[PDB]
């Protein structure tokens, strides 16, 4: 209903990720802002425990789809904002083809005037000489289509897409994403007709940051409904 | 430094008085925070024209880039602040500056649907053919987001004028996710689907995930589009990388009429996806018993 009013302007963001991949424990914090009017994120992430034991690009999808641009004619299909401020639980399994998987559970909600994404990630069965633990991923990101479907019996949504990670020899590593979102609160939420998001991202580095980190610019827009 | 922070807060808050006070007290006009944002960024972004003007008079760097590669003109163009865009351009702003995705201000104006900004940028030398790092032109972004008036203007400026708002160019062009005009149109634009097919569009073009337009039409539940695609030779049993045929998708999402049309056109009821599931199986799994009955009888 009025969850979307919380996103009419620039909103500060905080991200906290607690991770464990093949026994390597790590913590990531992020801060920045989002403007859902334009579907734009401007963020910076730091691995606060030291060296990140996986490639930064593998963590992009885990690290706030409430900041997607939903055009006016699609406002009734924006589940993400409808669940605010109480927020939603976002759960994923990410299957890296011919390698391990991530399982994540996050809560995305307002805490004061800040939109907070707090995540737990567990990775298992990765190959020591694979693209992930072997750090063979290029430091970049592709454009994707994200497919969104209502999950009526859970009063939420299902989301599916495939992430394509460029590998340093010119090949591509697929990361198959299976996602579910459910509201935290009891209030009414919007269950959408089938549609998609289209994404753009750019990864970079802060020259003045000595810690392991990722600077992220992201543009996401919803489409597919007339 | 301490003054620098205060100028940033004042510029962000649109506090004209305090901005002039802080300047008179020696504040650095080119102060930057820990993400490269300057007072001119904040003033331009948030529509504070008078502050933009005084900062530039005092020597603010008009093309300062923040961590995400953004200049004040990027932010003004996105926000639709026309007068500020003009002022920035009049004070040496690079009209074709790039953010880290490779967006020019013209990309961003087209993205955000600001027609008057688009025209202004073109007037000041914006590169109408600029591509971002995903190959998108400003025209492409306009077409994508349904900003048809802007698409017309951009196509004319690119020298292929007339009829841009209703799409344009090669019917078999594809972008980096492998989408052709037909993939875009499959999402409920029936008359456009028809036009494209009559104009030679490849009905079975598969995108980067293996989806044909028929997959997308089945997913979005558009019966007449499913019908016209089949009429013009759509592969009724095309499988994506997950092994889904269009009949699988229709069975999942409860599209009975589409199920019937697919069967009529030779859909395979025994096709298994990657998890060994048939359309009947998925119909059961998703609570669509009526479709399950039709599928079994078939």
Author numbering:
A (entry chain B): 2 to 64, 68 to 230
B (entry chain A): 12 to 309
What do the study's own words say?
DARPins are engineered proteins that consist of 4–5 structurally similar repeats that stack on top of each other, forming a compact protein domain. DARPins combine all potential advantages of single domain binders over antibodies: they are small in size (ca. 18 kDa), possess high biophysical stability, have very high expression yields in E. coli, can easily be genetically encoded for in vivo applications and are devoid of disulphides and hence well suited for applications where they are expressed in the reducing cytoplasm. Structural investigations showed that these DARPins bind to different but slightly overlapping epitopes.
To connect 3G124nc and either YKKD or YRLK we chose flexible GS-linkers. Therefore, two linkers of 7 and 11 aa named GS7 (GGGSGGG) and GS11 (GGGSGGGSGGG) were tested for linking 3G124nc with either YKKD or YRLK. The resulting four constructs were named gc_K7, gc_K11, gc_R7 and gc_R11 according to whether they contained YKKD or YRLK and the linker used was 7 or 11 aa long. The complexes crystallized under various conditions with different unit cells and one to four complexes per asymmetric unit (AU). All GFP-clamps form 1:1 complexes with eGFP, in which the clamp indeed wraps around approximately half the eGFP molecule and creates a continuous large interaction surface, similar to the superposition of the two parental DARPins on GFP (Fig. 4(a,b and c)). The buried surface area (BSA) of the GFP-clamp complexes is 1625 ± 72 Å2. Between 7 and 11 hydrogen bonds were found in the different structures. Hydrogen bonds of Trp79 from the GFP-clamp to Leu44 of eGFP, Trp79 to Leu220, Gln81 to Lys41, His114 to Gln204, Asp143 to Gln204, Asn156 to Arg73 and Phe226/230 (numbering for constructs with different linker lengths, respectively) to Asn198 seem to be the most crucial ones, since they are found in almost all complex structures. The structures of the GFP-clamps confirm the intended design: both DARPin-derived domains overlay well with the parental DARPins when superimposed on eGFP. Most interactions between the DARPins and eGFP are found in the single DARPin complexes as well as in the GFP-clamp complexes, confirming that both domains can bind their respective epitope without strain or steric hindrance.
